């Protein structure tokens, strides 16, 4: 989703604008409308206040939000001193749905002058059929009592069925048990007669009453539709948040109203069933079930309860092979769960996804989570309501709908409401781009010395490709970055370099087109003391998002997965390749030939040096002829009967004598090794060993030597 440049809307103060959200479209036209409820708006209609509105806000180029076709049509009367409706206590705009040319806007707190008595109770819905507008009130049909559909609040939650049926949910349709009402659109509009206040439709399918055990369950609190038995007709899944001893979600057949599998939670008061979504994550057409528990609380990191919320993914598979998993929240009191918005292929690279929001998380303002779906699901983006509270918690994410595309996306775009601040924001989904790449090393060492002045020249691979589906700009300007050698300290050095530039790294600019064609570049890869450590090849890439956006300004995005940052190793001959495994056998030994030397600035004590390692890769073998304190290599031997150019370097860091001499077989590069032994401490008397520092000779076991000298 996109958060940097969204589209936002607002309305009258205190109007609860954005409490309900959906998408209106025109029949085979691009003038799509982002329907959004304003249930608390003052009504600009005769003889009525406190009615609310459903505002049509266009998609682009304008922020105008205008009321529905039903406007300037006030309270109808019953007699000369009695209004037919007790409107001015309603919430018109609390639930909005649209399929192709239809509106289902409902006022769950609408009241009407009843016929049985003079009381007021029912919820009403105002459809639209092209120009004609009709009234829907399935809970108004002679069932005027709290025992039945009097307190129905019908239309609190509504949904659409592929058979062109409308699934209406009134949690109070029964004694707050709730009921699903499904009526065909053709039957509703055809049977319209305004003088009849309780129109009956013949093909109505609705859930009947239950026992007194079921009560206050709010069956119609949340609704969704899917196929859960495999007959091509959408079943009715419903959010019953307070069922099974307030621990539920019901599934009803589309054409039979029969009871399919029920889902229950293990936590209490978590409100398991506040929102329900029906989509596919695993891959098979058998639709999954999602249940929200925004008040879920479990044992935390400190061993104490914390309310973080939780959701449930039900991988409903045929023949009873059901699998379930639970996703936990992350921020305390954030009410993670709440609005679960079934998105669909928010990323086309795979199957559908789900948006779960936290209306009271983040700094100070609302939080939205995103869960991408992969095979078997179990995949357990972030959005914030940066709008600040005015006089009410800005419940960002409380209302959400992301099932419908509104652009040249394929991905479905997301609408978010912030009713507590009187506003609604459009989160447009972004075009996903997946990428793959790799590289390897082709080239022998001594033959590279003939590369030009002569240097060493090697080769590696430069292959990357993205391709990707969807409608987005054909050519994408990718930035790629590569490293010659990695795992180096800030002070470490390079070994392989680009001869044309000697740069230890290189980044490339490419405007690659979208396609399956493979595109790779071309490049060719005794002054360095480091041999043993392997050369590390590294690969990095990115995309100039700013110029890659379309005319609408929708920013492209690379794959949210596919972590990149990939790297591989390499090795070159003549470093230790002269040895097949480069395993050394040191036996590094020296001896103190001379003894009985007087103590104190006398003639230097003569020692001997010899080598014992037989490893084939005995490059850079070190001669650290360690000595005790108060000694130094005074009088470097010049005779050099078998000595080599080993000249030592001396230092006394942290009271450690360096005397580092240097050199492929155990050989007696021997000469008189002298030491000043200028001991000034008369109370002391008389530890000689060869320290290991050669990586080519380094091993987990270092056969060394240890000897002393006799002084008198």
């Amino acid at each position: 989703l996109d958060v940097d440049s969204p589209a936002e809307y607002s309305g009258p103060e205190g109007s609860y604008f954005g409490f309900a959200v959906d998408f209106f479209v025109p029949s085979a036209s691009s003038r799509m409308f982002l329907l959004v409820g304003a249930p608390k708006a003052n009504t600009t209609q005769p003889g009525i206040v406190e009615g609310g509105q459903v505002l049509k806000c266009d998609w682009s180029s304008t922020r105008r939000c205008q009321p529905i076709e039903f406007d300037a049509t006030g309270n109808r009367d019953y007699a000369k001193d009695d209004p037919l409706e007790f409107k001015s206590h309603q919430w018109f705009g609390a639930s909005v749905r649209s399929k192709q040319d239809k509106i289902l806007a409902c006022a769950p707190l609408y009241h009407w002058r009843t016929e049985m008595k003079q009381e007021r109770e029912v919820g009403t819905c105002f459809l639209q059929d092209g120009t004609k507008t009709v009234e829907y009130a399935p809970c108004r049909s002679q069932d005027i009592d709290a025992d039945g559909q009097g307190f129905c609040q019908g239309g609190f939650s509504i949904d659409f069925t592929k058979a062109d049926r409308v699934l209406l949910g009134g949690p109070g349709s029964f004694y707050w048990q709730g009921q699903l009402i499904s009526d065909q659109v053709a039957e509703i509009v055809s049977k319209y007669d305004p003088n009849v206040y309780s129109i009956k439709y013949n093909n109505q399918l609705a859930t009947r009453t239950a026992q007194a055990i079921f009560d206050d369950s709010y069956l119609g609190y949340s609704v969704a539709v899917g196929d859960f038995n495999g007959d091509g007709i959408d079943d009715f899944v419903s959010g019953v948040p307070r069922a099974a001893r307030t621990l539920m979600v019901y599934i009803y057949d589309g054409k039979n109203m029969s009871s399919l599998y029920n889902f229950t939670g293990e936590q209490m008061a978590a409100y398991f069933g506040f929102s329900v979504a029906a989509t596919d994550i695993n891959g098979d057409d058998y639709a999954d079930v999602f249940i929200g528990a925004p008040l879920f609380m479990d044992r935390g990191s400190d061993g104490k309860l914390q309310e973080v919320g939780q959701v449930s993914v039900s991988l409903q598979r045929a023949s009873g092979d059901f699998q379930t998993t639970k996703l936990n929240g992350f921020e305390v009191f954030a009410r993670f769960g709440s609005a679960i918005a079934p998105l669909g292929d928010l990323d086309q690279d795979g199957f559908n996804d789900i948006a779960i929001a936290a209306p009271y998380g983040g700094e100070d303002k609302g939080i939205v989570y995103i869960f991408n779906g992969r095979s078997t699901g179990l995949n357990a983006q972030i959005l914030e309501g940066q709008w600040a509270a005015r006089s009410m918690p800005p419940s960002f994410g409380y209302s959400m709908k992301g099932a419908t595309d509104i652009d040249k996306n394929g991905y479905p775009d997301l609408i978010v409401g912030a009713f507590g601040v009187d506003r609604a924001i459009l989160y447009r989904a972004r075009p996903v781009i997946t990428v793959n790449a790799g590289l390897e090393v082709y080239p022998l060492n001594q033959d590279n010395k003939t590369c030009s002045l002569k240097v060493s020249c090697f080769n590696v691979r430069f292959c990357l490709k993205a391709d990707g589906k969807g409608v987005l700009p054909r050519k994408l300007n990718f930035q790629v970055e590569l490293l010659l050698d990695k795992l180096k300290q800030k002070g470490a050095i390079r070994r392989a370099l680009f001869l044309y530039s000697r740069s230890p790294s290189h980044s490339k600019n490419m405007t690659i087109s979208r396609g399956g064609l493979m595109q790779c570049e071309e490049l060719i890869a005794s002054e360095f003391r480091d041999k043993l450590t392997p050369i590390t090849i590294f690969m990095e890439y990115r995309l100039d998002y700013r110029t890659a956006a379309d005319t609408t300004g929708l920013q492209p995005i690379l794959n949210q997965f596919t972590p990149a940052n990939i790297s591989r190793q390499a090795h070159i001959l003549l470093d230790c390749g002269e040895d097949n495994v480069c395993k050394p056998k040191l036996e590094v030994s020296v001896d103190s030939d001379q003894k009985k030397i007087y103590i104190g600035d006398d003639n230097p004590l003569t020692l001997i040096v010899k080598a014992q390692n037989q490893g084939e890769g005995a490059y850079e073998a070190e001669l650290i002829v360690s000595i005790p304190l108060q000694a130094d290599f005074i009088g470097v031997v010049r005779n050099n009967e078998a000595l080599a150019r080993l000249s030592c370097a001396f230092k006394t860091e942290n009271q450690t004598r360096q005397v580092v001499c240097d050199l492929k077989a155990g050989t007696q590069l021997l000469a008189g090794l002298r030491f000043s032994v200028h001991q000034q401490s008369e109370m002391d008397t008389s530890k000689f060993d060869l320290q290991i520092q050669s990586s080519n000779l380094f091993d987990k076991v270092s056969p060394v030597v240890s000897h002393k000298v006799d002084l008198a």
Partner: protein, 368 residues
């Protein structure tokens, strides 16, 4: 070098000294580090604040007696336990909004039982009639004079009564130094933090007090019921001992409710209200206090040292306090002085203040 103490009595209602002889005199010189021991055995009762909460809705058709009886018994039960008791009450039925408050006929607003041929006072917000006062006789007289009202749906909003009770520090009462007990009585599956959508109420409950000038809860009609995790937060923050004193028909639900809110326990309301009286006594054994001493009026001299010969004959130098003292535990403090320099004074004195304790340790030194 002399040092002579006087108050050997180990506490009394009249002899209110909760320490050893607490008046010590001594004659010293520079660097005359002297030693003496004190016993600070605490024999005083523990402080407590108790809040009584009722549903008192039309769900309490005849169950209002169980609430009224428990409040009086809870008052007299803890008076026996302790004489530092402060008690009060506050009531709540449900939110005054469309699907509950009976808004349609002009008759129902003053009486939502009109159609039942009986009267009931208009269903209200959280209105507590009594702040915590030591007057036990006023509490049971006022708490018994309240009646019930009617909401449409079976669940009741007594959860908001808990939240307001645990955030209104001064309107209803909370003492800093006392233990805090909150008993909440209900008989229905109470609304939980999200039932306000059906009522148009979409504001989460807050940790702020909203009683206001009038006793009625101002935000009862514009903010939702409290979250079960929010009640866990404010409860432990203010050291509230919550008791979901509910009925047997819903005890199992409220039992499982308590396992989610730590430190909470339930009790079946009945004529024999012992399900909760043996519970508040349990909380009495967990509110055991501590003993700590302080230094005051010290003239920038006369260094003092303490040894913690505290419970179960444990000795640890440097420490000056031991926790978890029941009534009657005799913690001793061997105190050693350290005088430095030569003040330009002949007679000086300064006091040791046992924190939270009425009495104090005073030492007078005559020196030159």
């Amino acid at each position: 070098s002399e040092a002579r103490v006087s108050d050997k009595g180990s506490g009394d209602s009249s002899q209110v000294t909760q320490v050893s002889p607490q008046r010590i005199a001594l004659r010293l010189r520079p660097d005359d580090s002297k030693n003496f021991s004190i016993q600070v055995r605490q024999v005083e009762d523990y402080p407590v604040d108790i809040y009584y909460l009722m549903d008192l809705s039309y769900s309490m058709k005849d169950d209002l007696w169980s609430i009224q009886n428990l409040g009086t018994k809870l008052a007299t039960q803890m008076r026996k336990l302790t004489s530092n008791l402060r008690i009060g009450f506050g009531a709540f039925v449900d939110k005054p909004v469309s699907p509950y408050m009976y808004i349609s006929p002009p008759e129902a607003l003053e009486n939502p039982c009109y159609d039942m041929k009986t009267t009931c006072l208009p269903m209200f917000g959280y209105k507590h009639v009594l702040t915590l006062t030591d007057q036990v006789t006023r509490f049971n007289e006022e708490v018994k004079k309240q009646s019930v009202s009617r909401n449409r749906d079976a669940p009741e909003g007594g959860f908001d009564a808990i939240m307001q009770a645990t955030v209104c520090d001064e309107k209803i009462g909370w003492r800093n130094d006392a233990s805090h007990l909150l008993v909440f009585t209900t008989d229905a599956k109470t609304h939980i933090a999200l039932d306000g959508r059906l009522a148009g109420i979409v504001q989460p409950n807050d940790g702020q007090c909203h009683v206001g000038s009038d006793n009625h809860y101002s935000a009862s009609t514009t903010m939702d019921y409290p979250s079960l995790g929010l009640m866990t937060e404010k409860l432990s923050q203010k050291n509230i001992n919550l008791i979901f004193a509910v009925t047997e028909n819903v005890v199992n639900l409220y039992q499982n409710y308590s396992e989610l809110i730590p430190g909470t326990t339930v009790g079946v309301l009945s004529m024999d209200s012992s399900n909760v009286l043996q519970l508040i006594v349990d909380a009495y054994g967990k509110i055991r206090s501590k003993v700590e001493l302080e230094v005051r009026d010290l003239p920038e001299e006369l260094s003092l040292s303490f040894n913690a010969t505290c419970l179960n004959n444990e000795v640890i130098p440097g420490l000056k306090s031991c926790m978890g003292l029941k009534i009657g535990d005799t913690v001793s403090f061997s105190i050693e002085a350290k005088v430095r320099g030569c003040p330009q004074e002949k007679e000086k004195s300064f006091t040791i203040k046992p924190v939270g304790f009425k009495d104090s340790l005073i030492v007078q030194v005559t020196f030159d």
